[PDB]
Amino acid sequence: RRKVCYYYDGDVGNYYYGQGHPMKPHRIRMTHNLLLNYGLYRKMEIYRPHKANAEEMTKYHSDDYIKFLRSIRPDNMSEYSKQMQRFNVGEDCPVFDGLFEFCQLSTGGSVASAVKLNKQQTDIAVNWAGGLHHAKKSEASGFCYVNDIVLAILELLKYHQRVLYIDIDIHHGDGVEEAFYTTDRVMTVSFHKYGEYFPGTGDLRDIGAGKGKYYAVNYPLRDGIDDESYEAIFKPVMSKVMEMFQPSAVVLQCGSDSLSGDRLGCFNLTIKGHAKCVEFVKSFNLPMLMLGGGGYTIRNVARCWTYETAVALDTEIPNELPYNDYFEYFGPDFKLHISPSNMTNQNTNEYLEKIKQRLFENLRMLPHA
Amino acid sequence: MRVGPQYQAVVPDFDPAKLARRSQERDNLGMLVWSPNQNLSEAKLDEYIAIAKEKHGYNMEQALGMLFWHKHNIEKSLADLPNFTPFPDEWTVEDKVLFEQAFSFHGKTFHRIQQMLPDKSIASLVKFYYSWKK
Amino acid sequence: SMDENYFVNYTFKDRSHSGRVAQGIMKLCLEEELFADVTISVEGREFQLHRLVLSAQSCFFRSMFTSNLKEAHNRVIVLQDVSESVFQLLVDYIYHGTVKLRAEELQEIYEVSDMYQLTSLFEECSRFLARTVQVGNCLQVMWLADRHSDPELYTAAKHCAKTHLAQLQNTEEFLHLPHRLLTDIISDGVPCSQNPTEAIEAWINFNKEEREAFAESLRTSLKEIGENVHIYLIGKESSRTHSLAVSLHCAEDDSISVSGQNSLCHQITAACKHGGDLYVVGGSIPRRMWKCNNATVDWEWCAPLPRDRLQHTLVSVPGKDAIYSLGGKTLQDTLSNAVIYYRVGDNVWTETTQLEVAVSGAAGANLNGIIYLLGGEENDLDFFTKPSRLIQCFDTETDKCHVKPYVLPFAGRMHAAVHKDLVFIVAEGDSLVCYNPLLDSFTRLCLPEASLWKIASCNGSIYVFRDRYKKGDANTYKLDPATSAVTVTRGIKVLLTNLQFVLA
Amino acid sequence: PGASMDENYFVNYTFKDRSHSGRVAQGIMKLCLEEELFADVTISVEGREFQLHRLVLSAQSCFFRSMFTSNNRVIVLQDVSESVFQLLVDYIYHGTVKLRAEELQEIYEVSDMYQLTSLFEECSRFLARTVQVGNCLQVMWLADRHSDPELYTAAKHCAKTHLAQLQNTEEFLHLPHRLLTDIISDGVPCSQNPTEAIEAWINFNKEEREAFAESLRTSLKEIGENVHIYLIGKESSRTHSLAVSLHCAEDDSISVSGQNSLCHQITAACKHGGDLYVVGGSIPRRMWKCNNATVDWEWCAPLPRDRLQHTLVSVPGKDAIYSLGGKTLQDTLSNAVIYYRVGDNVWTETTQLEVAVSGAAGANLNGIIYLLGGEENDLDFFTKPSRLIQCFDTETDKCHVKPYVLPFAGRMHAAVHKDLVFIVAEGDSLVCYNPLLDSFTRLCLPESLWKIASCNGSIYVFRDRYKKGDANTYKLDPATSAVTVTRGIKVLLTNLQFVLA
Ligand SMILES: O=P(O)(O)O[C@H]1[C@H](OP(=O)(O)O)[C@@H](OP(=O)(O)O)[C@H](OP(=O)(O)O)[C@@H](OP(=O)(O)O)[C@H]1OP(=O)(O)O
Ligand SMILES: Cn1nnc(-c2ccc3c(c2)[nH]c2nc(Cc4ccccc4)nc(N[C@H]4CC[C@H](N)CC4)c23)n1
Ligand SMILES: [Zn+2]
């Protein structure tokens, strides 16, 4: 029974991205409802995120970007085309009712979670609302409008010394890496698929520059990686980083679009190994901060996030889903875990040894402290 | 990868002697709705949850909020549970019928569906759409 | 080799000692008729021929010349019956290697070239006879393969006689057909509209009192299948956000029929057809693929695309039950070379060996074991992409990609569809060429201009379509590929206006 | 590839058979020689009888065409051989003959007598490869008499540079005027003493050739010995890296000339003509020009591009120095071919390579530029030891990759010898590439990466780490694999970064 605080609002489940769009902000509400039927509330605090504002939001983004996101509305759609087409808030990040309201809700959740973590009141802070780690400084990308994990890390940096960022999401966390590509107080470790995938960044040879050299550990993979390989690649590198970096706060972005068979997913990882990875990072009793981000199949996302919330609390849960409003929604297997698909992995053992050895050489160059 | 002050963040500096002064000054940015009670076991909570379910129609969130509203006192919660009507989105049968018609005519475009249902905000029809598809 | 040393002794492997001999024989042995030692006379005319080339190229002459009978040692040997002109063509082929096969004079060359065992000409004539059997001789060439044991022609002349069994029923040649041929033509899935039961009953009705108990042996072996040979059309109506999937059915009674529409409503890009069902990559994010069904109009779900690309080439291959995707563009104007292939029975997307030169927006044509990447655009080091002209051959059995040397007569965006061996090609500035991969040559076929053209091939005839629909005459041209007889069909009530993709 | 409009594939067309060269060429070698029917001519040479076929012989050699088609069943050839004519018939029928050094000249004379042009050219090349000093005045006599200009030049180049010890041979004393004029007017070296050769040739019959003597003096040219083997390496403790310029002598005394000792750094150097070209500087772009006699470090135009571990190959045919492959500081293996002109001091581009390689070995072949091995990029994020042979033409500016591959891979150093491309690599195994007939040979070495330099007809292979085993400078006889050890008189190097041939 460790003190874990949780953030949820009833408004985040209503915002709609449009017809035929991958990301559905209704998934978080069903994830909360699955927790709302497992009894996990009895051993975990539940808070309501506050609606964000401008001055705490402008700490990273430019003023004109926030002004646009405040002034946007679907009613003057055919009146401000230039402003849309410059800031890339068009067909890749569709506009809708209360877009800035969505940004307020997610930003308030993540920043208040950082305020809880940074005050030694709650050890592990969980917020599945935010985690949008693709928004850049003055432009939207990857369905992410405002970069919340960067704001959370910026808040943690005012009190802590060194903050370690962990990225399990299938996409490259370019948004967080872009902001901290020069500073020396944040180490961003991102495991992302890159043969041609979105966003195409995250090459091996891009490690850092300026003051922040060797303070960004990128790690490419290939499609179809199974569970045992992923564990064998996630245990050594994380132990090595936490041995030579000694951070005081770990912000883990627990992505959920790397599971077995999402619409934009490509990996072949089950919930069991994903939970084993997060438990591995959790087993270092550091001040944690969970985030969301990603996830494009509502059933799999709900199952994965409910099992992650269960493992963060160290509570065993039955495999059979309980009496609720979502009997036929989760069918027909009615279970919690997901069987792996038939995708054939393309990352051989020798490739994995070579990439781990290269990362070890890169990390040996960290200055002694 | 781009480099420039127009892309990266302006990191604040660290002061070892400033952590305590800054920590105790900031407010708790959030309102509490539930806290665990160690003296309150699971049996009577499981009973009271079905109590709120079947005769009065309370859902999980509103029923659990009342427990903290009375500081985890089940008896007082039973006393005051009929006094508060759990105000839902009042979807009358006619509202379901026109929502049915509008979905068939226009599809997933809820902005247009608002036109035949002007009294309901979009954030409310999306919730009913996800609840109906069950 | 450790034994040979270039300064003491080595073996001189001469790679030019095939051109010199083959040119010396065609130059010195034919243009002046010297060194003749055998005289072959066919139908009066006297020939002078050299025993060496003949005996070294056709084993039949090797057996005739090197026999032990005293008739062979006589100077003049007489061939009983081939022809006057056919034997001239055969001598021309044996010496030079270039013979002008004609449609009027092919079957004679087929039988004779099989009698003399010139297997290369025999195979070429087999293919060229498989090309030109429409319906009329489809039960006379079939009988010319069962008697000669050439199963490829026997299959290609059964496929085109099964699908016309209705009209073929009344012909007396079908009525005089022996049992084995009828058993082999019926037991392969006669189409539903051909009335095979009427055909078998009419075949018995010739002598029913002698074959009545013999009749039911075939009724217990008849197979039935429904007509599912289509020409799928996709195109939006330029005003409605939903792009339909009109499914044309090609009939033989000058009435090309239209089946039910599908009308998916997201977006359409780079679709493919395989078997009897349509595959389409689409959605707001072009990664998810829908699987359409023809009879039961439903939009099923399949495994989404694992990678990110646009303007790629979807090629169907029914040989190993796969759908290949090749080439493409990668979101930063970088042309990629990578082929991911999908299996219908497993819903998995794996990789294979990569292409040599990356192309995008090309046209692919299946050839029952070889996937051809035709044209498209290729990268240029001057920061740009130029209209490409390369013919990239991607194998699917051995998985090796190689680039053919010769190039197309034109370049740019193009659409291709196959016809019985060939890869027909059309592009902007109408000029219909007729690719042929086995002997690597082109032809041409002018089109009536008085707008990019689309090609779909079905029922033996080739239908070319327009992009802009404003009613000139019917904007749907039925082309006869033999005599270039460009006719115009009806297009009964097609409501299309853009015609984004036409699938063969 | 001809878009013919007359032919239609459903009516008529021309069946161009591309397999109708193998069938006849195999049918003749199987049916006409293995069991010998269809024989209609009988050629008897030195008692032994042949049955042959006038068709093939008259279709391959024009002399037999003029013979058979003139205006008896058995015809006897006057004088060729028993074995040479057997080899000639075997080549005419099959297409493979085993050329030997002992019976080569006879085959050359006969193959030119019967006008088999391909074997005549192959014998010309193979006989040009094997003239050291002994028959260099006998082969020259068989080139002027035979009108074979390439062999005549090849047997004159190797005879001009050995004029000192060739003076006392009586064959040179009985040498007619024209060949002497042509061997003298080519730039006889300084140490060969040409004037004493002139006087000694006249001294046979001076009272009859005295007035004829001065006709050659008015045509003699003089030049100094400037055939060098440039060595570049540091001494592992001094920043400046020297450029010792060896001079190869024929009296078992390899001489060392003056050093130059540039002081910045050296990477990817080359040699052309008689001077040295080097790439160096703190930023690897500025280029120095080294002169041997007048020891100076001249300046040339810098590199217009940015690359590392690239291959510099000399092309004296068009007075241009090329640069292929390399690495562009982002671990991206580039394929860009830039060339520099000596007389114009410009740095322009050409076509690009097909597959990019880095750190290979380049060998000029008097018209084609060979990229040998190295390491090629892998889509598996890394570099594997490459094995392909990349061809880069310099006359037509075309690039293509040969199908066959090397027997090994990795880092390697290459040098040429009169037609060939000699190769050594790690784990010594001397292979002898031959591009004209596409075959490999091997030459074992007595067992550290090795280096190869070519001069004076022999090959010299060096070591990287010196520490004195015997001399660390091996002279190899490429004919009988006679690996001997030279002196290396007072070489003070310790690294041997590059060896320029
Ligand atoms: O109503 P939405 O939230 O927009 O999502 C629906 C829903 O998918 P989710 O369960 O992921 O929300 C459908 O699923 P079912 O109700 O049929 O289980 C799915 O249909 P498929 O099963 O065919 O995927 C459909 O997809 P589509 O629009 O392609 O028919 C998809 O709609 P969106 O594409 O708009 O998200
Ligand atoms: C979190 N996350 N995960 N995946 C994505 C994501 C997001 C977007 C795309 C995407 C994946 N795949 C895509 N493929 C294409 C096809 C294509 C290929 C090559 C060249 C051009 C287009 N176009 C896409 N967007 C267009 C590009 C122009 C821009 N104005 C927005 C619309 C996207 N986001
Ligand atoms: Zn993601």
Numbering used by the authors:
A (entry chain C): 8 to 376
B (entry chain D): 1 to 134
C (entry chain B): 26 to 475, 481 to 534
D (entry chain A): 23 to 93, 99 to 474, 481 to 534
What does the paper say about this structure?
By co-opting KBTBD4, a substrate receptor of the CUL3–RING E3 ubiquitin ligase (CRL3) complex, UM171 promotes the degradation of the LSD1–CoREST corepressor complex, thereby limiting haematopoietic stem cell attrition. KBTBD4 contains an N-terminal BTB domain, a central BACK domain and a C-terminal KELCH-repeat propeller domain. As expected, KBTBD4 forms a homodimer through its BTB domain, which is characterized by a domain-swapped two-stranded β-sheet (β1 and β5)34. The predicted CUL3-binding 3-box helices of the KBTBD4 BTB domain are extended by five short helices in the BACK domain, which is connected to the KELCH-repeat domain through a linker sequence. Together, the BTB-BACK modules of the two KBTBD4 protomers give rise to a V-shaped platform, which holds the two KELCH-repeat domains on the same side of the E3 homodimer without physically contacting one another.
To resolve the mechanism of action of UM171, we next assembled the KBTBD4–UM171–LHC complex in the presence of InsP6 and determined its structure using cryo-electron microscopy (cryo-EM) at an average resolution of 3.77 Å. KBTBD4 and HDAC1 are well resolved in the three-dimensional (3D) reconstruction map, whereas only partial densities are visible for the ELM2-SANT1 domain of CoREST in the rest of LHC. Overall, the KBTBD4–UM171–LHC complex adopts an asymmetric architecture, in which two protomers of a KBTBD4 homodimer, hereafter referred to as KBTBD4-A and KBTBD4-B, simultaneously engage one molecule of HDAC1–CoREST in a bidentate manner. Although the SANT1 domain of CoREST is within close vicinity of KBTBD4, the closest Cα atoms between the two proteins remain 9 Å apart, and therefore complexation is exclusively driven by interactions between KBTBD4 and HDAC1. The two KBTBD4 protomers interact with HDAC1 through two distinct interfaces: (1) KBTBD4-A engages with the outer edge of the HDAC1 catalytic domain; whereas (2) KBTBD4-B cups HDAC1 at its active-site pocket. A single molecule of UM171 is situated at the HDAC1–KBTBD4-B interface. By interacting with both HDAC1 and KBTBD4-B, UM171 fills an exposed gap between the two proteins with exquisite shape complementarity to act as a glue. Directly adjacent to the UM171 binding site, InsP6 is nestled at the three-protein junction between HDAC1, CoREST and KBTBD4-B to stabilize the complex as a second glue. On the HDAC1 side, UM171 inserts its N-methyl-tetrazole into the active-site pocket of the enzyme, contacting Phe150 and Phe205. On the KBTBD4-B side, the pyrimidoindole core and the benzyl group of UM171 are embedded into a surface groove between the b–c loops of blade 2 and 3.
